[PDB]
Design a protein around this ligand. Structure first.
Ligand code: OLC
Ligand code: OLC
Ligand code: OLC
Ligand code: OLC
Ligand code: OLC
Ligand code: OLC
Lengths: 424, 60, 75
């Protein structure tokens, strides 16, 4: 898939896609420098470096560093995502929405539109909530000189955030349409990796100075490479199920052609469950953390802190669960068996029909567990590595690595899979 | 029941034993690809916020 | 500066709401999956929503500039 990487910069169409993507991401990053009126960014950054502010870390990380500078997209593309989750929940809870999801042409469009509308509304709600519970709280703690905690400021913030995430959702969809990879995933990706290089340079400077010893740093780096290589290997891994084509009935017995196989990945392609797990983890923190004067809500919020043992455990569980469920939904044995049926293929020793689906379902359900567990391991280990090396960075957290490698692999996989179809 | 999941674990372990792992060239390929991608966007975004903060700093 | 500032704010709100409308109207051409990279072989780039594309870009810049304006506004 390196060939895909270079061809995407070589081939005019794909390089147009790349340039457009880079342009949009440039617009987003630039948009990170446009502040919400009335907000004192200095005090926000000051608070985010305090002990109680640390819990906002992940919230900032997935905001693309925007929450830190409280830009027009203060929470990033995250509101939309949240809505999506909600929608999904409804779809799997309300039977009417499930029917609407399975109608075909229209319905999925209606659900998606509801997701977009709900996303914007969510950005409105979150803008208001943050304006009233955190920004103007404590006698207008994070306000600017000349601003007071009232309905005018709330109105301003709400408007800013609504228009902001509207524009950002639009930008994401335009990346999806006229650029490489998926828009949302690339926006989160950019929002995460934008912080990597300066942190590397800073840490290196600290090594030269003497605050960080070289051994811990080398372990950190080597562990990152290990993470990349490991995720790559597991993504490239597959369970082969022996099948046969050109089946002919001779002497009242079923025979087949040359023995082949169908490959089944440990995990279904997609960084989406990681996004959903992250957002789900972010909800209680978002609801509880703003209230700085309430030890209870601070306790609840810090309980889900991905840096702390409890929150990290919860995060691991969320990643494993969401991955396993998503892989279960994507790898439906019925459509696989029917795909083997339309091509005139069969499983040697297994009768066609429902027993075949049973065989496939059994193998898949027993298999994908390990991929889920692996993603959970990748979720877990980096925090320990940071604790042992003394080099802490939420951007290089297990969840962050999962995002980066996930998006990279997805984009390259799609590009390769499409240029392959172009060549043939 | 505990027996159900303690059986599920064994069967899943058996399926783990039947996993076809990728070649060396595949892992090298994937890792190199990931590195190129990540590094590329790191550099590009780096130039973005560099030029941006330099121009904004110029405006003062 | 009451009337003037109020007019600036009204412009901000108007641009915001109009932007919301434009974004909501521009519904993506969907497929089976919720979010994908899509087939990047076809050049596409039909007229489809070009006027509203350019309009959304312009209104994005205007909205940003208005955020900067309200930010720079005196006491
Ligand atoms: C000024 C703050 C950012 C505004 C971004 C507006 C949208 C531009 C994005 C893509 C258009 C590419 C042509
Ligand atoms: C889902 C929404 C949940 C809302 C959760 C609210 C949390 C309140 C906690 C502390 C506030 C303390 C100040 C309370 C201000 C009202 C004054 C008061 O304390 O009233 C007591 C009353 O007089 C006795 O009879
Ligand atoms: C039910 C979850 C509630 C509490 C469990 C709290 C967590 C207990 C288990 C933590 C396991 C873990 O992953 O801890 C890693 C540790 O933080 C080194 O980085
Ligand atoms: C919480 C972490 C649990 C981790 C459990 C081990 C997961 C190993 C599965 C695949 C790796 C295969 C590598 C070859
Ligand atoms: C300090 C100056 C405050 C000016 C307040 C302007 C409010 C304008 C709101 C209109 C929304 C009408 C629907
Ligand atoms: C204060 C906000 C400044 C916003 C600048 C907007 C730039 C638009 C130029 C388009 C010129 C008209 C093109 C019509 C076709």
């Amino acid at each position: 898939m390196v060939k895909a990487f270079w061809s995407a910069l070589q081939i005019p169409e794909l390089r147009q896609r790349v340039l457009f993507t880079l342009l949009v991401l440039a617009a987003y990053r630039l948009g990170a420098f446009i502040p919400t009126p009335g907000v004192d960014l200095d005090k926000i950054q000051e608070f985010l470096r305090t002990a109680q502010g640390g819990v906002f870390g992940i919230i900032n990380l997935f905001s693309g560093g925007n929450f830190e500078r409280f830009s027009i997209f203060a929470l990033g593309i995250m509101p939309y995502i949240t809505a999506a989750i909600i929608m999904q929940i409804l779809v799997t809870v309300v039977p009417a929405l499930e029917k609407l999801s399975k109608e075909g042409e229209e319905g999925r469009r209606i659900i998606n539109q509801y997701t977009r509308i709900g996303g914007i509304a969510l950005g409105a709600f979150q803008g208001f909530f943050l304006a009233t519970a955190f920004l103007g709280a404590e006698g207008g703690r994070f306000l600017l000189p000349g601003w007071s905690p009232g309905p005018f400021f709330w109105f301003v913030v709400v408007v800013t955030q609504v228009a902001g995430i509207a524009l950002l959702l639009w930008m994401a969809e335009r990346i999806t349409e006229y650029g490489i990879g998926n828009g949302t995933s690339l926006i989160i990706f950019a929002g995460i990796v934008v912080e990597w290089l300066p942190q590397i340079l800073r840490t290196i400077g600290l090594i030269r100075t003497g605050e960080v010893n070289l051994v811990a740093f080398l372990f950190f780096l080597a562990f990152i490479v290990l993470a990349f290589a490991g995720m790559a290997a597991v993504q490239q891994a597959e369970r082969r199920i022996p099948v046969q084509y050109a089946r002919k009935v001779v002497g009242g017995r079923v025979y087949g052609g040359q023995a082949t196989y169908i490959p089944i990945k440990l995990n279904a392609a997609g960084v989406i469950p990681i996004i959903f797990a992250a957002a789900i983890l972010q909800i209680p923190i978002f609801l509880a953390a703003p209230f700085q004067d309430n030890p209870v809500l601070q306790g609840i919020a810090n309980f889900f802190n991905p840096t702390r043992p409890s929150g990290l455990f919860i995060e691991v569980l969320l990643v494993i669960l969401f991955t396993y469920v998503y892989t279960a939904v994507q790898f439906d044995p019925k459509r696989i068996a029917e795909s083997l049926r339309e091509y005139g293929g069969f499983i040697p020793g297994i009768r066609p029909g429902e027993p075949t689906v049973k065989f496939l379902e059994h193998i898949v359900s027993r298999l994908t567990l390990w991929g889920a567990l692996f993603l959970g391991l990748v979720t877990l280990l980096p925090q320990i590595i940071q604790n042992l090396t003394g080099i802490h960075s939420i951007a290089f957290s297990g969840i962050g690595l999962l995002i980066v490698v996930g998006v990279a692999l997805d984009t390259l996989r799609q590009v390769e899979s499409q240029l392959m179809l172009r060549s043939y | 029941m505990f027996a159900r999941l303690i059986r599920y674990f064994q069967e899943a372990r058996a399926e783990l034993a039947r996993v076809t792992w990728p070649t060396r060239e595949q892992v090298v390929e994937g890792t190199q690809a990931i590195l190129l991608f990540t590094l590329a966007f790191m550099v590009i975004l780096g130039l973005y916020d560099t030029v941006f903060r330099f121009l904004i700093g110029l405006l003062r | 500066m009451d009337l003037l500032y109020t007019l600036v704010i009204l412009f901000y709100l108007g641009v915001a709401g109009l932007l919301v409308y434009l974004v909501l109207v521009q519904e993506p051409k969907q497929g089976a999956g919720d979010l994908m990279g899509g087939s990047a072989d076809l050049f596409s780039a039909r007229g489809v929503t070009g006027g509203l594309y350019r309009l959304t870009v312009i209104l994005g810049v205007v909205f940003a500039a208005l955020a900067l304006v309200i930010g720079l506004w005196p006491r």
